[PDB]
Design a protein around this nucleic acid. Structure first.
Ligand SMILES: [Zn+2]
Ligand SMILES: [Zn+2]
Ligand SMILES: [Zn+2]
Lengths: 117, 1177, 376
RNA sequence: AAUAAAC
């Protein structure tokens, strides 16, 4: 039962899995100011320089960013990769709630942003 | 890319049914039809339906009716297929196939009136008096078929160009009386929606158009125009009363052209929705919205409602042959039907897709009827989710076989008929006692004073005898001759006298003691049949014996003129037989290539086929055959089956009656089996676990079973290798059972496992739940099944949203008011040891909550030696109408062994819920990716990491509308949307990032997705709300796609039925998998990936098999398997058409090989390797 | 000023949540086989769970005659809107006003999401890609901008010297067509922004253009009587055919996804169908707008049914095969309607007024008394 | 931070 015991495919190296490693013919994206939020992170920039920074179809991350932005959580980020804010889901580096700092309490109980004292 | 579709289960679940003269004008026949398969049933009288013919079609039957033409001896059928194909077919005598009388292609671009998307189904109707026949093509066109060189050319009547402007047709019938064939039509000139009834109150109308066949004109008589807004089917009231009863959802009308409209209501939902003048039927609150009905006699009507309840409406008739009022009574409840037929007086067939379609019996009570249940046809219903699992009690002798040992569990049926189905393909015997007896190769069990007394083994030098009883133990004394081998040992008389034959002498025995002896050219086989013994040597000499009392066997050598050498023999008698002109028959195959049946007391020639060893389809009177066996199988040994062994190829024949010779001919039946002193291979057994039939010995064993159903059942037996010999065996510690030799010389006392039911095409145990089985999930640890179910309770509240809390509103209506159905879900826990549901283990959900998915999720852990833990995870959300925000809840469960409750060994297992938290929106699908639960909340697909106690999120993307299916392998998630697409994902794990790779840019209504696996090619198998299959691939170096964004379909195939389930298992083809699926019409199919070189030798075969063979109902097997047309990159072979290459005779097999350019032995090595590798389950 | 920093008390907005209807559709789907097996919804307020979306009840297309009011989504600056289109995943409604602002309305609870300032002009045309990638927006100045799905401004240029009125593009994402008030239908390349050819000879300002979904046609309306409808050809530039249909000023020209029908709305109180395979004859006409018929939106799943806008603020639903209309809001939507857009599930509808408002219409509930100010 | 809170 449960295919992973029967149809065990971990010994198979698919052409799908090879073609995404060395990226197999990604056309460079036109119209230079684009974002493509939702693109696979490139391992060429992790090891080496991938060259075409800013006009590469994959994303480039740096280890500088600290807190998540309010804007990626809705899918609206004009800044793109060169934002100062982290774009990961991690629900521990959120901004503090504005409605605690000025206006006492918050109104909705399902407020995502960080509630501190 | 290159694959083949193969079908491992014929689809069950009937849809259409009638009662017509299929074979002959004398008796009648239940003719049921399903998705692309026709069945014809007789009726043995306790009563039981008996199968008599089964037919397969390259097209799904959309309607079915029967008319009896002028001068014909039978009753023709009018089969309606998809995109307006009518096909008049008849039964044929002579050959036992179907003769097709007419096709009528009606698919035209100028008939569809510009509408591309066809929604309406074609509907055949015929006259009560059989004057014409009508077909409503496309919902706006009538095709009139005139009847009396027996047909007349049709003519299309445009419906919307007539009077009254029909537009929407609901149902249409022909009426009774009426010298011209009057066609009644329900329609709606101004169509409305239930839910918008304040601006359109009620609009349904009736035109009874009167058809002139000769003049080809048609005037409207008897219009009505203000029937209620929701009218379902109309029913022609029969001849002495006339008229029509028009079912509505909430009311019931009787209509006639001279009588004023009489109509009553049923429940009080006709308050503000219908201004038609309606009465109130008393003591009744029911609804007629999916109701199937028929007329029993006249002025009575059995109405199978939804909910399976059966009412009997009597039309209360005055003296004027008019209707005063209606009378209802609540009779017995039954299956949720999809059809309804009165057979003979007192019998009702209830054809149902979902549920076992059964036969009823009704008698009057001392007007009022009571229904009794005679027989039911087994049905694997609409297979919703089906999970592969492992059996429990495979014996320790078979325990170290290298292949996996597994059997699928299917959520079949719906509702009250909801069930689980434990399907299996081969038979795994229970071995109770084994031995190791070398040297001896043949075996026999005879009955001595009805348990079996003696086990007789022939060695190459001597003979072993065994005594049975308390302990089976080897026998030492005289009687049998152990000084040499024994050719054959068997009973003579009736279990009182035993005969063995040695290659020199012939021995009676009245028990252990020898009665007398007759000596005799090596004797190679014997025919002990009834009271006669025919003994044949090696050079072709034939002698015959006979019991004569004084008991003493008498030599009577047959008077035969040997034109050539007799090769093999058989004997056979007719307990309930058809061999007309208990009577004994001798079958005799000579070496010239002929077959001769002999009447046995005399020796005159009765039946003669001049070219026998080819393998022809139908034989009629006037190489190197090994073995030939005639046996009867079924109730009272009714129908006989020929079984031969010709050049490593099994081919078995039926028998059917057909008018100084035998009045029979032999029709060939299909197979899935290859065979690649004298030893018998065809070993007839009577009463093993009640089942009678043949065991077939060889390199692949096959149990041949025919029960009283009359349906042929071939069951393989793949465990424990090829089998040399076999014998039935009935003992004390072994019940009715069997006894065979392994190839390694191991005798095995065995009994069939008693929990299955071998009457069905696969051996299946049908587990009734009496609630709708939605999902099923094998848990490997602690070895149980987790099933989400649902029962229907009456709804009583209505949720609202007032900005601060939810406010329920109580439904408060009259006491004459049917209630809406609320569904309460609960998660069962099923034990494979005994299939009882485990008590005190049932998770029950909230008041409005619905399981949308259940899978078995492998989350990573720090406990075991691997990472994974095999949890059961269910996503579930609350349906409280559209005005309330739908939110959901992820539920992670793990089965935990505890100490058992005393007296209940099944209660050692119980759920423990690790996680139950309400999410931020609906939860729609779930997955596991290297130990990460992947969930789809709304328009976002999250990816959770389970900590010691809680789920913490890692990544997501914004997806399309409603992701309802996800499966994944090795950080690649494939998603599936309701309307849009599939959207394959990818997950780097070093950074917590989920991303989109590619997507189908078209709109497409996916049922469920899969992963086709080849050596390096990973296909993306997807099913279409259009009964299709298609395989997308991610090809970045291709240029007809765009650079890594668009998926491309590479294989297209039109399966006839919807698909929800997908199983992958490796073939017994270096690294390829078989991605199985179970079609929603109840069948089970395959997809086997092939190489290109093997593919195009068979594509050249299929293009020749399509053209040069007379298919059933005149259909085209190519256009049926074209994509969606019932742009197209077809690359999947029709393995149900390539299987008609095996059915061809070997004279005709060699003509298609020479017309495509190969030898026939290569194609048989091409095809039969696709059946060897696919022998799972 | 609304900067999003002033607090407010929580409220549960009216919702027209499509999720409990799809789940009911996926559960019926298994044991249904057609519509002929379907258990009928009965007109009472207790049968609310049994609604299926318009994929479910595929015939009976009178389903999505959306005559139940939901919500007027208005701005604070009150500008008259021209084009309103749904994001193709149904997540949000962008709205093109007269001040060039893109007010993104939420898709279930229709509150507000964000406002932009796209153009320096009234937005006149707005199309999404055939995938989720791009969004073309033209304005009254003549500029054509591309828009990503995160509403980032991407490459801009000028297509016309005068006000563009409608855009559409090929059955792939390569080649669009902008018609303007100078009378030229200029056909553009996508990736290069290259004016491939100009479709001259219209003879009047042209105010609508649609592309054929397979065959590669461009069908243009006009403000000129002598050449009211000109078929075109995107590869040759040759005028393929001329259709003399209406008396004056075809406002919209639309096409099914099937590709066998040409639907045309004009200022002479008429809508007309045309089979594009047979231009000499004529399919049915659509009388029922008492004033000018200025907007048309075909239905996405129910082929053959379309809503329709009036210049008097009227809203009407039509169906191909029926002489009268299926049912509409005469005089009930205030103002002049400019454009209509169905949700990708064809269950809710949006309208854009010459008023400063936009109203969302959904299907009627079972068993309700339609006694409201819009129906009765 | 770029309108998170715009009945
Ligand atoms: Zn890069
Ligand atoms: Zn950002
Ligand atoms: Zn807060």
């Amino acid at each position: 039962g449960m295919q992973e015991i029967i149809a065990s495919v971990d010994h198979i190296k698919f052409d799908l899995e090879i073609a995404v490693e060395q990226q197999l013919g990604a056309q460079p994206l036109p119209f230079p100011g684009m974002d493509k939020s939702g693109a696979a992170v490139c391992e060429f920039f992790l090891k080496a320089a991938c060259g075409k920074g800013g006009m590469c179809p994959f994303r480039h991350i740096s280890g500088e960013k600290t807190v998540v932005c309010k804007h990626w959580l809705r899918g609206l980020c004009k800044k793109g990769d060169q934002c100062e804010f982290l774009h990961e889901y991690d629900m521990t580096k959120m901004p503090e709630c504005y409605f605690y700092s000025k206006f006492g309490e918050c109104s909705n109980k399902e407020c995502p942003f960080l509630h501190i004292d | 890319m290159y694959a083949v579709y193969k079908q491992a289960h014929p689809p069950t679940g009937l849809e259409f049914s009638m009662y017509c003269n299929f074979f002959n004008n004398s008796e009648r026949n239940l003719v049921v039809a399903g998705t692309s398969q026709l069945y014809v049933y007789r009726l043995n009288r306790r009563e039981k339906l008996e199968l008599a013919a089964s037919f397969s079609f390259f097209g799904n039957v959309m309607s079915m009716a029967s008319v009896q033409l002028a001068g014909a001896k039978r009753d023709a059928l009018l089969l309606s297929f998809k995109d307006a194909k009518l096909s008049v077919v008849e039964y044929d005598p002579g050959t036992h196939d179907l003769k097709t009388l007419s096709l009528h292609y009606f698919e035209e671009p100028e008939l569809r009136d510009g509408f591309v998307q066809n929604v309406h189904t074609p509907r055949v109707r015929v006259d009560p008096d059989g004057r014409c026949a009508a077909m409503l093509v496309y919902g706006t066109r009538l095709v009139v078929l005139p009847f009396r060189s027996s047909f007349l050319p049709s003519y299309i009547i445009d419906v919307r160009a007539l009077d009254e402007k029909l537009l929407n047709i609901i149902d249409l019938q022909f009426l009774h009386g009426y010298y011209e064939p009057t066609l009644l039509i329900l329609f709606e000139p101004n169509q409305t929606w239930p839910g918008r009834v304040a601006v359109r109150q009620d609009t349904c109308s009736i035109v009874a158009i009167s058809l002139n066949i000769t003049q080809k004109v048609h005037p409207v008589i008897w219009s009505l125009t203000s029937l209620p807004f929701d009218c379902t089917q109309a029913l022609a009231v029969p001849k002495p009363i006339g008229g029509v009863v028009v079912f509505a959802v909430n009311s019931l009308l009787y209509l006639n052209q001279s009588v004023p409209p009489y109509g009553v209501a049923l429940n009080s939902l006709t308050t503000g929705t219908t201004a038609f003048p309606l009465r109130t039927q008393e003591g009744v609150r029911i609804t007629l919205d999916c109701a199937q009905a028929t007329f029993i006699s006249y002025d009575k009507m059995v109405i199978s409602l939804k909910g399976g309840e059966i009412y009997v409406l009597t039309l209360i008739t005055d003296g004027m042959r008019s209707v005063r009022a209606f009378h209802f009574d609540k009779a017995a409840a039954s299956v949720l039907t999809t059809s309804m037929v009165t057979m003979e007086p007192g019998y009702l067939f209830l054809g149902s897709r979902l549920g076992n379609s059964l036969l009823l019996k009704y008698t009057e009570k001392l007007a009022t009827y009571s229904f009794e249940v005679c027989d039911s046809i087994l049905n694997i219903g609409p297979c919703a989710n089906a999970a592969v699992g492992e059996p429990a009690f495979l014996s320790e002798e078979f325990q170290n076989s290298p292949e996996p040992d597994l059997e699928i569990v299917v959520c079949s049926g719906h509702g009250k008929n909801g069930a689980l189905s434990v399907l299996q393909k081969s038979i795994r015997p229970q071995v109770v006692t084994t031995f190791e007896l070398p040297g001896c190769y043949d075996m026999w069990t005879v009955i001595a004073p009805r348990r079996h007394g003696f086990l007789i083994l022939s060695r190459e030098d001597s003979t072993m005898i065994l005594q049975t009883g308390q302990e089976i133990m080897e026998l030492d004394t005289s009687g049998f001759a152990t000084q040499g081998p024994t050719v054959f040992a068997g009973n003579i008389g009736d279990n009182r006298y035993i005969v063995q034959v040695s290659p020199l002498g012939i021995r009676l025995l009245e028990g252990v003691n020898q009665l007398h002896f007759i000596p005799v050219a090596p004797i190679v086989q014997c025919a002990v049949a009834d009271p006669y013994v025919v003994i044949m040597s090696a050079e072709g000499h034939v002698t015959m014996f006979l019991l004569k009392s004084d008991h003493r066997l008498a030599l009577h050598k047959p008077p035969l003129h040997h034109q050539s050498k007799v090769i093999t023999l058989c004997l056979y008698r007719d307990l309930s037989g058809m061999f007309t002109t208990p009577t004994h028959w001798c079958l005799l195959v000579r070496e010239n290539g002929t077959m001769e049946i002999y009447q046995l007391p005399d020796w005159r020639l009765v039946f003669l086929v001049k070219n026998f060893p080819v393998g022809q389809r139908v034989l009629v009177d006037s190489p190197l055959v090994k073995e030939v066996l005639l046996v009867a199988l079924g109730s009272r040994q009714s129908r006989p089956y020929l079984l031969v062994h010709v050049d490593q190829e099994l081919l078995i024949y039926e028998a059917f009656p057909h008018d100084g010779n035998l009045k029979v001919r032999f029709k060939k039946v299909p197979h899935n089996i290859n065979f690649r002193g004298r030893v018998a291979r065809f070993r007839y057994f009577e009463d093993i676990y009640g089942y009678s039939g043949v065991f077939i010995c060889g390199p692949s064993p096959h149990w041949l079973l025919v029960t009283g159903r009359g349906a042929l059942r071939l069951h393989p037996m793949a465990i424990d290798g090829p089998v040399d010999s076999f014998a039935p065996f009935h003992n004390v510690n072994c019940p009715r059972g069997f006894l065979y030799f392994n190839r390694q010389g191991e005798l095995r006392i065995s009994v069939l496992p008693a929990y299955l039911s071998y009457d069905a095409p696969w051996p299946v145990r049908k587990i009734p739940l009496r609630c709708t089985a939605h999902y099923v999930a094998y848990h490997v640890e602690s070895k149980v099944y987790a099933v989400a179910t649902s029962t229907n309770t009456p709804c009583a509240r209505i949720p609202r949203m007032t900005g601060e809390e939810k406010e329920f509103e109580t439904i408060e209506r009259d006491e004459r008011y049917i209630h809406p159905q609320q569904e309460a879900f609960s998660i069962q826990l099923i034990s494979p040891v005994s299939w009882e549901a485990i008590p005190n283990a049932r998770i029950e959900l909230q008041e409005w909550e619905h399981v949308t998915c259940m899978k078995t999720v492998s989350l990573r852990s720090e406990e075991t030696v691997s990472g994974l833990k095999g949890y059961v995870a269910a996503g579930t959300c609350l349906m409280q109408g559209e005005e309330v925000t739908c939110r959901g809840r992820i539920l992670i469960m793990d089965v935990i062994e505890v100490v058992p409750e005393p007296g209940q060994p099944l209660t050692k297992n119980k759920f423990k819920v690790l996680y139950e938290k309400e999410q931020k929106g609906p939860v729609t699908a779930l997955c596991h990716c290297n130990g990460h639960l992947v969930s789809a909340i709304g328009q976002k697909i999250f990816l959770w990491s389970l900590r010691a106690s809680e789920l913490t999120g890692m990544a997501f993307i914004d997806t399309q509308l409603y992701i309802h299916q996800m499966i994944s392998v090795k950080n690649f998630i494939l998603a599936a949307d309701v309307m849009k697409s599939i959207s394959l994902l990818r997950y780097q794990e070093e950074s917590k990032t989920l991303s989109l790779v590619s997507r189908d840019a078209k709109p497409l209504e996916v049922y469920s997705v899969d992963f086709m696996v080849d050596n390096a090619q990973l296909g993306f198998l997807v099913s279409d709300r259009d009964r299709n299959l298609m395989v997308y691939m991610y090809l970045p170096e291709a240029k007809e796609s765009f650079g890594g964004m668009r998926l491309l379909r590479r294989a297209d195939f039109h399966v006839g039925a919807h698909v929800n389930t997908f199983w992958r298992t490796p073939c017994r083809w270096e690294n390829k998998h078989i991605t199985w699926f179970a079609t929603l019409d109840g069948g089970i199919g395959l997809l086997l990936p092939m190489q290109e070189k093997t593919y195009r030798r068979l594509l050249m075969l299929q293009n020749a098999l399509t053209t040069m063979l007379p298919h059933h109902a005149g259909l085209n097997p190519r256009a049926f398997r074209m994509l969606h047309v019932d742009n197209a990159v077809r690359n999947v072979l029709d393995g149900e058409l390539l299987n008609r290459y095996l059915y061809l005779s070997t004279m005709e097999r060699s003509e298609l090989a020479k017309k495509i350019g190969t030898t026939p032995d290569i194609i048989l090595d091409d095809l039969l390797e696709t059946d060897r590798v696919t022998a799972h389950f | 000023t609304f900067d999003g920093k002033r607090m407010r008390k929580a409220v549960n907005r009216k919702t027209i949540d499509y999720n409990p209807s799809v789940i009911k559709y996926l559960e019926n789907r298994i044991w249904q086989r057609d519509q002929r097996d379907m258990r009928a919804i009965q007109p009472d307020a207790g049968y609310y769970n049994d609604l299926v979306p318009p994929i479910g009840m595929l015939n009976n297309p009178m389903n999505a005659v959306t005559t139940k009011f939901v919500r007027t989504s208005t701005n604070k600056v009150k500008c008259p809107v021209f084009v309103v289109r749904w994001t193709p995943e149904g997540r949000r409604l962008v709205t093109g006003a007269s001040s060039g602002e893109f007010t993104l309305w939420n898709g279930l609870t229709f509150n507000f999401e964000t406002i932009l300032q796209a153009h320096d002009s009234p937005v006149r045309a707005m199309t999404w890609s055939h995938n989720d990638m791009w969004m073309l927006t033209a304005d009254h100045g003549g500029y054509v901008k591309y828009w990503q799905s995160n509403m980032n401004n991407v490459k801009m240029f000028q297509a016309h010297k005068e006000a563009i009125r409608e855009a559409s593009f090929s059955p792939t994402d390569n080649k669009f067509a902008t018609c303007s008030d100078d009378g030229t239908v200029r056909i553009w390349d996508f990736l290069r922004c290259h004016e491939e050819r100009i479709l001259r000879g219209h003879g009047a300002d042209v105010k609508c253009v649609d592309w054929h979904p397979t065959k590669g046609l461009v069908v243009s309306g006009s403000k000129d009587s002598q050449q009211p409808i000109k078929f075109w050809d995107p590869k040759t530039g040759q005028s393929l055919a001329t259709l003399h249909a209406h008396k004056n000023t075809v406002m919209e020209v639309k096409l099914n996804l099937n590709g066998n029908w040409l639907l045309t709305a004009s200022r002479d109180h008429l809508c007309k169908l045309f089979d594009i395979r047979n231009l000499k004859e004529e399919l049915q006409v659509f009388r029922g707008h008492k004033k000018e018929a200025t907007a048309v939106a075909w239905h996405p799943v129910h082929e053959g049914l379309f809503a329709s806008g009036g210049s008097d603020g009227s809203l009407l639903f039509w169906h191909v095969g029926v002489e009268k209309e299926v049912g509409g809001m005469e005089m009930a939507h205030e103002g002049m309607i400019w454009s209509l857009a169905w949700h990708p599930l064809g269950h809710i509808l949006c309208s854009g007024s010459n008023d400063h408002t936009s109203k969302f219409w959904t299907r009627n509930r079972p068993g309700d008394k339609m006694r409201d100010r819009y129906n009765l």
